[PDB]
Amino acid sequence: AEYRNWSKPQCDITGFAPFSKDNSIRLSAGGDIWVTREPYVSCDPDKCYQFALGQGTTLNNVHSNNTVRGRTPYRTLLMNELGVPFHLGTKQVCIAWSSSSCHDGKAWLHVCITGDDKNATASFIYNGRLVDSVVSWSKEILRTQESECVCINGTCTVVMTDGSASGKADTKILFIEEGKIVHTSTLSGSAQHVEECSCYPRYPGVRCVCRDNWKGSNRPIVDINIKDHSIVSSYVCSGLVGDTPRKNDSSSSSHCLDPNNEEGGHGVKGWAFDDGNDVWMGRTINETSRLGYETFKVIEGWSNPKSKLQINRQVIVDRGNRSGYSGIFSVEGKSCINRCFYVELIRGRKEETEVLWTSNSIVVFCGTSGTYGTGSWPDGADLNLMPI
Amino acid sequence: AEYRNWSKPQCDITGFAPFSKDNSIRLSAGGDIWVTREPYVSCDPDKCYQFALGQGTTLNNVHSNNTVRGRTPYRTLLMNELGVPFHLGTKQVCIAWSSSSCHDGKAWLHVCITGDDKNATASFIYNGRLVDSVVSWSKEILRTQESECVCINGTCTVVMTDGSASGKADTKILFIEEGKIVHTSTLSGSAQHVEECSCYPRYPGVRCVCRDNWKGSNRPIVDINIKDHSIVSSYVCSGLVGDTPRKNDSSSSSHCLDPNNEEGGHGVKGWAFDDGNDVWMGRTINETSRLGYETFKVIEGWSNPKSKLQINRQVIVDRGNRSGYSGIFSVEGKSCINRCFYVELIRGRKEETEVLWTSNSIVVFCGTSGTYGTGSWPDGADLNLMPI
Amino acid sequence: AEYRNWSKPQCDITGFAPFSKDNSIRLSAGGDIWVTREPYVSCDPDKCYQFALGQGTTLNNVHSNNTVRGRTPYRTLLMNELGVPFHLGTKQVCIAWSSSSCHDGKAWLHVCITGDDKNATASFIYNGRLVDSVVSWSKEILRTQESECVCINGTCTVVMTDGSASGKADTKILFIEEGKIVHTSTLSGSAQHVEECSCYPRYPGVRCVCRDNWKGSNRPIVDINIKDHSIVSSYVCSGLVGDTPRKNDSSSSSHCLDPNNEEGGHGVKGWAFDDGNDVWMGRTINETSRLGYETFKVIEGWSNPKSKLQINRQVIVDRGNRSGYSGIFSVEGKSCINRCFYVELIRGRKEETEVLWTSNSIVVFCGTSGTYGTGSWPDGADLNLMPI
Amino acid sequence: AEYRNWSKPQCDITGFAPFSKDNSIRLSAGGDIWVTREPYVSCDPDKCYQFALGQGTTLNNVHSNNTVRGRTPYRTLLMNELGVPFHLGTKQVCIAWSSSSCHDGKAWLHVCITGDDKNATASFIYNGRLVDSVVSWSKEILRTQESECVCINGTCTVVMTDGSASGKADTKILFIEEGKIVHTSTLSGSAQHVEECSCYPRYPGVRCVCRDNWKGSNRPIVDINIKDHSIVSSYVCSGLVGDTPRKNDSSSSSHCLDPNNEEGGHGVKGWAFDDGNDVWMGRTINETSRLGYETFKVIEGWSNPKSKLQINRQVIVDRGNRSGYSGIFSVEGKSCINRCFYVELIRGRKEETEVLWTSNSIVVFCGTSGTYGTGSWPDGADLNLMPI
Ligand SMILES: *[C@@H]1O[C@H](CO)[C@@H](O[C@@H]2O[C@H](CO)[C@@H](O[C@@H]3O[C@H](CO[C@H]4O[C@H](CO)[C@@H](O)[C@H](O)[C@@H]4O)[C@@H](O)[C@H](O[C@H]4O[C@H](CO)[C@@H](O)[C@H](O)[C@@H]4O)[C@@H]3O)[C@H](O)[C@H]2NC(C)=O)[C@H](O)[C@H]1NC(C)=O
Ligand SMILES: *[C@@H]1O[C@H](CO)[C@@H](O[C@@H]2O[C@H](CO)[C@@H](O[C@@H]3O[C@H](CO[C@H]4O[C@H](CO)[C@@H](O)[C@H](O)[C@@H]4O)[C@@H](O)[C@H](O[C@H]4O[C@H](CO)[C@@H](O)[C@H](O)[C@@H]4O)[C@@H]3O)[C@H](O)[C@H]2NC(C)=O)[C@H](O)[C@H]1NC(C)=O
Ligand SMILES: *[C@@H]1O[C@H](CO)[C@@H](O[C@@H]2O[C@H](CO)[C@@H](O[C@@H]3O[C@H](CO[C@H]4O[C@H](CO)[C@@H](O)[C@H](O)[C@@H]4O)[C@@H](O)[C@H](O[C@H]4O[C@H](CO)[C@@H](O)[C@H](O)[C@@H]4O)[C@@H]3O)[C@H](O)[C@H]2NC(C)=O)[C@H](O)[C@H]1NC(C)=O
Ligand SMILES: *[C@@H]1O[C@H](CO)[C@@H](O[C@@H]2O[C@H](CO)[C@@H](O[C@@H]3O[C@H](CO[C@H]4O[C@H](CO)[C@@H](O)[C@H](O)[C@@H]4O)[C@@H](O)[C@H](O[C@H]4O[C@H](CO)[C@@H](O)[C@H](O)[C@@H]4O)[C@@H]3O)[C@H](O)[C@H]2NC(C)=O)[C@H](O)[C@H]1NC(C)=O
Ligand SMILES: *[C@@H]1O[C@H](CO[C@@H]2O[C@@H](C)[C@@H](O)[C@@H](O)[C@@H]2O)[C@@H](O[C@@H]2O[C@H](CO)[C@@H](O)[C@H](O)[C@H]2NC(C)=O)[C@H](O)[C@H]1NC(C)=O
Ligand SMILES: CC(=O)N[C@H]1[C@H]([C@H](O)[C@H](O)CO)O[C@@](OC[C@H]2O[C@@H](O)[C@H](O)[C@@H](O)[C@H]2O)(C(=O)O)C[C@@H]1O
Ligand SMILES: CC(=O)N[C@H]1[C@H]([C@H](O)[C@H](O)CO)O[C@@](OC[C@H]2O[C@@H](O)[C@H](O)[C@@H](O)[C@H]2O)(C(=O)O)C[C@@H]1O
Ligand SMILES: CC(=O)N[C@H]1[C@H]([C@H](O)[C@H](O)CO)O[C@@](O)(C(=O)O)C[C@@H]1O
Ligand SMILES: CC(=O)N[C@H]1[C@H]([C@H](O)[C@H](O)CO)O[C@@](O)(C(=O)O)C[C@@H]1O
Ligand SMILES: *[C@@H]1O[C@H](CO)[C@@H](O)[C@H](O)[C@H]1NC(C)=O
Ligand SMILES: *[C@@H]1O[C@H](CO)[C@@H](O)[C@H](O)[C@H]1NC(C)=O
Ligand SMILES: *[C@@H]1O[C@H](CO)[C@@H](O)[C@H](O)[C@H]1NC(C)=O
Ligand SMILES: *[C@@H]1O[C@H](CO)[C@@H](O)[C@H](O)[C@H]1NC(C)=O
Ligand SMILES: *[C@@H]1O[C@H](CO)[C@@H](O)[C@H](O)[C@H]1NC(C)=O
Ligand SMILES: *[C@@H]1O[C@H](CO)[C@@H](O)[C@H](O)[C@H]1NC(C)=O
Ligand SMILES: *[C@@H]1O[C@H](CO)[C@@H](O)[C@H](O)[C@H]1NC(C)=O
Ligand SMILES: [Ca+2]
Ligand SMILES: [Ca+2]
Ligand SMILES: [Ca+2]
Ligand SMILES: [Ca+2]
Ligand SMILES: [Ca+2]
Known part of the structure; x- marks a missing residue:
């Protein structure tokens, strides 16, 4: 049982093939399912797990009212094997209203954030125990990725941000080894605002496509060298921009270094990755509202x-x-x-x-070198008929 | 952990002994059980699993109305250990409105089909990761076995069909190694229409008893050759024929190479297997509608x-x-x-x-070389007393 | 893994200490619990498992009505780890209105009987596969232990009975190896009528204390030599008798060789085992109906x-x-x-x-060489308050 | 598979970081959850489990009326992995209205106590089997820790009490090897009343901080030597006292050797540990009720x-x-x-x-050598809306 190095070439990608769907809300109209948001997927060397931030209630439950609020003390990080809906026997791995997780090849790491808005604690849990913890530095809603962290040769990286959701905030990259924060680097380079990174291994380092909640509807890239802890940052060049909200296809513009100053305010967690000089990316279909999802x-x-x-x-x-x-x-x-x-x-x-x-x-799709058709795989539920 | 070959002779069979019963509907009148159809069973070297395409819903649920519909975005392939009903902790192992699974002696392969009717994707998931995928090739409901695939020396074979359900159609046989498609042989031989193949190993090959939905109330046999990828096909010779609908025992006839043209349109997945020059097979008791089941x-x-x-x-x-x-x-x-x-x-x-x-x-029955008696093991739910 | 020989002396036993209690009925007034009967406990070399014969329904279910019937084609043998109640997650191992199970130290064997009254079938399932089966031999309710079988050097044994509930009947002792009936020895000795044996290892053989439904309120003993397949039989000498119904403490009597001819009709499954020339035994407290339980x-x-x-x-x-x-x-x-x-x-x-x-x-108790006190641990459910 | 000896220094502690929250009551508002009390957490070498005392019922369930009663024959010790809440799949591991638990590195010991108030039995269950039992020695509610025991080089140790809740009483320290009570020391030293010890491994011996239900608001301390079985005892010197009820922080006083005689009667289980000459300890915030909870x-x-x-x-x-x-x-x-x-x-x-x-x-917190913010993590259920 060795550490993951991720030192293989990236697979050829012709697009994405269907992988998993949980049908969570349809199942809750007739069963006991966790209320959740901020879900994500991560995998040990064998199988993939699904993660979400619970609201300490099931759906057909009085405690369901007002689960729109995103920071309560009852929010827990749920963890099932992928495709197992979040039923009552689901394991709550930590107290978190914001989190991130990754397996280094030997054990699970879990970065969990709970507490008061202005004084939050982030806990680091490795191989089933708490190993370290850090306070909020800017005392303004400390938060992390809401998707998987990445570990290379034993060192795990995670991007955290404390500060304003609409001005310069303070972003850091922590390097965790077996639960212990061994080094902390601060955000450097040209990305002016970073949130909710979607990171991946790009041997020998790590790459992150994040969210800019301030002036940018193009997406910040962050590049983490794992050996010397140096950080570079920029934006996703692409004239077609990953964020929501944004300008329509004809009207939009981007820039390789700065925020586009186009509809910039607000955003959503999204992802992208290089393919030579090309970019694969997903986004909501509508430019302003979180309706529909496409990739190209x-x-x-x-x-x-x-x-x-x-x-x-x-x-x-x-x-x-x-x-x-x-x-x-x-x-x-x-x-x-x-x-x-x-x-x-x-x-x-x-x-x-x-x-x-x-x-x-x-719903979950995986890249493929093979061929694929079309179809739409939405949520499914008829809210006109749900509990109460 | 070695690859399976099934390089052993077929066991003496004097009939079938009772093996398993899930009591799924009766349970779902006082419990939370998935709605499903197209169920099946495959086993790893240790133990047996039950599969079904779920309908992304439980039974006592608003979403269960109109579950007669065969293909939806919400259908997922379910997988419990055999005997475990489909409760909420059941894993959905892929998105699928038609599927097939098998185990090569090292890990599970799942062949999963979802998407638009005229543009469907078949995703190939092996050892808990996506390895390959194919588009519909004739853009008319890409479909597969709805029972176990078969692996020999870690080369797995699956039969897939795309095209009309009442005229000539396009049947292919895939050869999957560690989730990777290494070859696609097209259907050859004298079989005119092939669907829902019930395959089994027959060292060194694989043999399938299928469903002719077009002209034949006999059952196509498709013989796959694992090593040189060749395909021959015909029909099950017996005069008491496998399909439903069909005609009574007195009027029915067969043919070793052609559809019988006797009430052949429409069908049902069924199975058969050779014993020397004899045939073991099961079928519905009613000739036209799917009531009763018998084996001989x-x-x-x-x-x-x-x-x-x-x-x-x-x-x-x-x-x-x-x-x-x-x-x-x-x-x-x-x-x-x-x-x-x-x-x-x-x-x-x-x-x-x-x-x-x-x-x-x-209900599951297994081959026995010992003795056995009689009994009938239906579903036994009272529908008059179920959820409004 | 190695086969169990049970080649160790019986522990000193000063009485029994509390071990396990499932609270099935009480939990079913606010949960989805299986309707069961004919329960039993057996242990693999690490941990214990509980078994019961289910009724193809949960308690809060419409199908729970008339579950006083012992023989339906919906009855399956349930298997959970000891102290896990029979929830919808529970595995059904085989179809059975009568069963016996044991672990030879490598795998589980289950002996499962289902089918028609006059033509029942016994299935022998070992290491998650069906390996043998036998027909009812006298066409009158083929039935077996309703508790654990015993396995010595990978040769398991089990007692079955076919024939009258109130007259001579045909009892046989099967020797099963890796699921395969290697021998069948018919009952021999002075035991007149024999049902539902509670068997235990007693190196170099096995011993059983059964239920005479015919002419005895004393209990039948059967001995089984594992190596030569010979069978001797008698009754539990003790003038204090173990079956129910029976005569009261002051009136009763016994016979080391014959049924006592005392209220001997009917019975109840029960147990005894020898400690030198002494006998540990449990029985119902009330002599004529199944109320209370005592040990001495x-x-x-x-x-x-x-x-x-x-x-x-x-x-x-x-x-x-x-x-x-x-x-x-x-x-x-x-x-x-x-x-x-x-x-x-x-x-x-x-x-x-x-x-x-x-x-x-x-409720379940285990032998102790330590000390103990007193209590009552009944069911504790409130029927006047149960799902009406 | 070696035995734990805990021969390693106590970690640097700056305070506590959030580890886990179970949200159990909030879920039973729409889910089938066990009624519990006296919970606790213990861990094997890999991961942590959570135990609590069931009331032989779930919450939304008519049997839940009156569960303020602490000793009923339906109380069982529950054992899930930590953060998996007590749903219907939870394993009842023994009969118990009082218990302790611990893993010695190879298997679990559970110390389980049930029976009559005046004649309790304590069962000792190790590696999945019953190895011993004791009767109550003074015939007045025999009781143990309601938290983990501690094991060192294969010798485990538990504190038990029998006798008055509000006067002198009989406390013993049992030493258990592989489930076998190998020695019994009686309580010695300054401590006058010892209940519900929270014990920890302080190499080469064990230390416990307990509850005095009689004359103290300061907390008994009990040193256990594991090699020569010696017991000393005293009280938690600190002038800020750990028990509830107590006198306020201006009025209170402690004493290193004797109870303090201050509102002393009654109590609540609690914990403390030494850090050189300093003391880390927790307690309720209210002095006379079990409202709030603080650590310093x-x-x-x-x-x-x-x-x-x-x-x-x-x-x-x-x-x-x-x-x-x-x-x-x-x-x-x-x-x-x-x-x-x-x-x-x-x-x-x-x-x-x-x-x-x-x-x-x-809620569960773990010592950290890093930094932390603030917050509050209450039950958070809404009793005004709950069941009936
Ligand atoms: C079965 O499923 C497959 C795979 O999903 C479908 O094939 C895909 O079709 C899509 C959408 O039409 C293709 O994506 C599009 O690519 C266009 C490229 O145009 C041509 O140029 C190349 C040369 O580089 C030629 O090889 C090729 O023949 C093309 O004609 C883009 O310009 C498109 O972008 C524009 O259209 C979209 C959608 O309408 C707009 O929203 C955009 O804003 C933009 O204006 C588009 O991206 C895709 O490449 C095809 N995939 C594959 C693998 O071939 C089948 O069409 C489908 N069959 C059926 C019956 O549904
Ligand atoms: C207890 O359980 C056992 C085993 O399940 C039953 O025995 C089986 O009974 C079936 C049904 O009768 C037998 O199957 C039948 O075989 C017939 C063979 O014909 C003859 O030839 C052989 C020798 O070559 C003789 O042994 C035999 O006696 C016959 O003379 C077929 O003719 C049957 O098919 C026809 O009957 C059925 C209706 O039953 C129709 O629906 C068909 O369309 C067709 O016309 C049938 O296949 C089977 O062989 C038996 N198995 C064994 C191992 O013996 C017992 O009957 C049962 N006992 C009770 C009391 O129920
Ligand atoms: C706390 O818990 C313990 C253990 O459970 C109890 O001690 C047990 O008590 C029972 C019942 O009282 C004892 O079992 C009885 O043994 C009797 C033997 O009688 C005496 O005579 C012989 C021979 O002269 C002496 O050797 C022996 O020492 C005895 O003193 C039997 O006569 C009893 O059977 C009769 O009475 C019962 C009701 O008790 C009737 O229902 C029977 O049909 C019959 O008439 C019975 O078998 C048992 O031995 C004790 N166990 C142990 C390990 O010592 C404590 O009493 C209990 N304490 C409290 C306060 O509840
Ligand atoms: C974000 O979260 C962090 C960590 O939780 C908080 O920092 C802690 O704050 C608490 C509350 O004030 C501190 O606890 C207190 O410690 C005092 C020690 O006094 C001094 O100690 C030394 C030397 O004198 C100095 O370093 C320091 O300046 C202190 O002034 C105690 O006196 C306090 O006890 C009293 O307070 C409570 C009520 O608050 C009473 O009920 C007590 O009985 C008693 O009268 C108290 O124990 C704690 O030490 C801090 N920890 C650390 C590691 O810094 C931040 O406060 C928080 N930030 C924000 C903005 O909320
Ligand atoms: C059960 O559903 C039927 C049919 O509903 C159809 O399938 C659904 C999943 C969804 O696609 C609906 O829009 C479809 O109608 C319902 O009966 C239909 O109701 C519609 C609108 O109310 C009406 O126009 C038609 O008469 C019905 N359609 C058909 C094809 O028969 C019905 O409401 C549901 N029944 C109950 C008792 O709830
Ligand atoms: C295999 C089977 O059905 N066993 C029964 C058992 C046997 O019938 C008994 O050993 C005689 O052979 O009887 C049990 O019967 C209970 C139930 O059955 C009616 O037929 C009876 O007349 C009623 O009084 C009623 O109690 C038993 O527990 O004794 C159940 C068991 O399933
Ligand atoms: C073994 C047992 O019953 N333990 C109790 C515990 C003990 O009574 C305590 O150690 C003193 O010997 O007390 C707890 O009970 C609270 C409960 O007690 C009733 O008798 C009384 O009517 C009320 O005070 C009621 O709250 C406790 O929480 O202190 C719990 C534990 O189960
Ligand atoms: C930790 C946290 O609160 N995350 C929340 C984010 C952040 O506020 C943004 O990242 C702004 O920085 O906003 C949400 O409303 C959203 O967009 O879905 C909900 C999400 O839970
Ligand atoms: C892939 C697919 O849709 N299969 C469906 C088949 C096909 O229509 C037949 O193979 C004819 O092509 O028909 C069913 O109604 C049936 O017969 O039970 C249900 C099944 O789901
Ligand atoms: C997009 O941009 C503007 C809205 O600001 C609008 O005037 C224009 O018509 C839109 N163009 C398209 C192609 O939708
Ligand atoms: C986004 O939603 C609005 C309706 O609120 C619609 O007018 C607009 O055109 C949508 N964008 C797209 C691409 O459909
Ligand atoms: C399986 O394939 C290998 C090739 O790697 C071959 O050498 C082996 O003998 C094959 N198995 C059988 C049974 O022929
Ligand atoms: C036992 O039962 C008989 C009734 O058949 C009765 O004569 C006798 O009194 C009973 N003995 C006792 C001790 O109750
Ligand atoms: C035996 O059971 C019946 C049940 O109604 C009861 O009336 C009778 O009194 C019991 N006998 C004894 C001796 O307890
Ligand atoms: C605490 O309460 C007691 C009541 O006996 C009293 O001695 C004291 O004045 C109180 N302390 C404060 C700070 O009010
Ligand atoms: C303790 O709880 C009681 C009950 O509500 C309350 O009245 C009292 O004020 C509390 N005491 C303190 C010191 O907060
Ligand atoms: Ca329910
Ligand atoms: Ca933005
Ligand atoms: Ca047909
Ligand atoms: Ca009798
Ligand atoms: Ca006190």
């Missing part, structure tokens, strides 16, 4: 901020159906590292007033 | 299309109770390979109107 | 039919609460073989009319 | 009975929210033994009269 390859979109040339569009979720967050994760094949992605399908408040609650289901 | 040996049924000589009839489900699909699976003993079979006990729509859902339960 | 030692109970000298009484279930079936199982310590017993606590029909169903819970 | 360090709190200088306070549960029992457990790190604690959050009767039941949820 942008030719020259990693190095040309003028490129708007998309090939291989797939609809994952049709524009009439709600979506949400999304993030990457990497699965090691025999010869190559695959990239896969999960999409959050949010139902309930405040967009939908049919119910009093707010939760999600997920 | 036809003497010279494997080779002599005039033979109508059955010895060893067992009622499995009596004539007055609903059955459905049924398939073979194989189990390796100390000395030899046993053959077993399950039976889908379909309840609900469109045949029964007391309820709005369509679901199933199952 | 009879001085000279094993070699004196006129002995009525009890020491070491413990009340397991008090005379106002319902008991039922009860059986032995054995557990290997470092230096000795402990003997333990379970007690079925039945509730519902026919004796209790406040509910429509018939189910049970269990 | 007292400088010179382990030697100076005049010292009232607290540093590093944390609020675990705010003053207006309920708590209850709280105890310690210890976790072996790479280099050091860490100390963690759990806090029982009791809800319901007789304090809260909106509901008929009495149950609890739980």
